[model samples]
Target: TVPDEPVGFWVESIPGNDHTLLLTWSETKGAKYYEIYLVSDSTYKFIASTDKLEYYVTNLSPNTKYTFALIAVNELGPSNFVTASSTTDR
Candidate 1:
């Protein structure tokens, strides 16, 4: 059965000095992919499909702040957006 509420999310990164960031979150019934966002003061950029509960965001600027979100989807449409954030470093 599909849960009525959204689950929790967590963010992580690979060891060493790389610009790759990984985000993982609990799954819902009809979630196809997570909508990843890179946020800046001016605007937000959309990343590609996650295909799983976990996603890797790459080619990011070091010491940058990014905001992310996910929505459950089905034949009908996408649900409300769940949000998260992360910061990268060297």
Candidate 2:
């Protein structure tokens, strides 16, 4: 069965940095692991997956607007994705 949608999804910008962001979200039942992605106009690519609650993203172009998404997945299916976006500090 599809799991509960994750809540409290958010991102934190590192001070004095422009190429990275920290991602995190509240946990939900039935999620064996989590997947992260970088979203652009009409498309997205996988960034990483892990059971850990937090992800450190890097190597982003300075001053670019980026949209990031996440989903909780288990044996059954992927949960509905939660998305958040932020622009680089530079």
Candidate 3:
């Protein structure tokens, strides 16, 4: 069965840097991997996949805002997505 939606979805910026954002979420049981979707051009697009519980997003525009969604995946399929948004440092 697919795992439940991930929890603790959140984003943070590196101090003094406006181009790097760190994203983290609670781990899900039975998850084989995770997919990260980032908002681009008015739509969410696939950006990365990993088995870890956190991801670092880089090379973003200064002071710009971005939204993201995370999905937990396993043998059955992907879970419902969890979302969060944040702005980079100015």
Candidate 4:
């Protein structure tokens, strides 16, 4: 079941330099870590794991349309995805 308080989460920023994508997000309580994803075509791929509120997705192509999703981690495992996207800067 979904939490009562809306389970606050967000993608803060996506900074790119030389094909590296830096992702930042807001942290929440009871969350152990975060799972980040990059969407390609119509499917999502696991990008990285982050213990902090931010992560970096490396080896991405320039000018790409990559959708992102964040999952709140706990002892019960990951919660429902909090989705977002990042397009590489030109």
Candidate 5:
């Protein structure tokens, strides 16, 4: 069973890349995959979904703050959302 609260989440800018952020998280119980989202002001915009724990988010604005959220999904449904924020390099 998936927990109502997430275990862990992380997001950070990759070295030598001002436009790319590396996202990752701990494996969740009963998770078939995870759906990711980008924080766009008031809305959480859908970005991608994957079974891989690591994701490379590319072509983002430089020197800007970004918030990312992800939730685990299985046959039962989805788990609680976990968010992480990081700023892009200039």
Candidate 6:
């Protein structure tokens, strides 16, 4: 089942890992899947997709800054993107 939009979606970074990030959000009522994007200087690039409520992003550079965006999708289409940022430990 797909809904018109997704709600309560957000992202966060987990501590203790210099090259890993944890992304989580409130599941959409009828979402079939979720799309994750890596935001570069001025663009959003597709990175991964999943059916779960959380994702762990790994293999990043230490002391680097990154921006990510997420979208919920289904048979109907994709929801609006939600973005977030995090910095890796040195």
Q: Compute each candidate's TM-score over C-alphas.
A: 0.76, 0.91, 0.94, 0.75, 0.91, 0.84
- In candidate 5, position 66 carries an lDDT of 92
- Encode model 4's per-residue lDDT on 1-90: one tens digit a residue: 321111434433354364666667665667777777766666778888778877767787877666777777777666777676656767
**Best candidate (score: TM-score):** 3
For model 2, residues 1-90, the per-residue Cα lDDT tens digits are 877777888887888899898888888888899999989776879999989888989988888888888999999999999998777866
Candidate 5 or 3, higher lDDT: 3
Which 10-residue window in model 6 sums to the lowest lDDT?
1-10
The CA lDDT of each predicted structure is 0.68, 0.86, 0.90, 0.64, 0.85, 0.78
Taking the tens digit of each residue's C-alpha lDDT, what string does model 3 give over 9-36? Answer: 9998789889989999998977899999
Task: Indicate whether candidate 2 or candidate 5 has the larger lDDT.
Answer: 2
lDDT of 6 by residue, 8-88 (tens): 555555667788877777778678899999999779988899999888888988778888888889887887788877788
- Which residue ranges in model 2 land beyond 4 Å of their true spot? none
The per-prediction tally of clashing pairs is 0, 0, 0, 0, 0, 0
* Model 3: CA > 4 A from native: none
Least accurate stretch of 10 residues (summed lDDT) in model 3?
39-48
Q: Give model 4's TM-score versus the native structure.
A: 0.75
Backbone clash pairs for candidate 2 read none
Show the colliding residue pairs in model 3: none
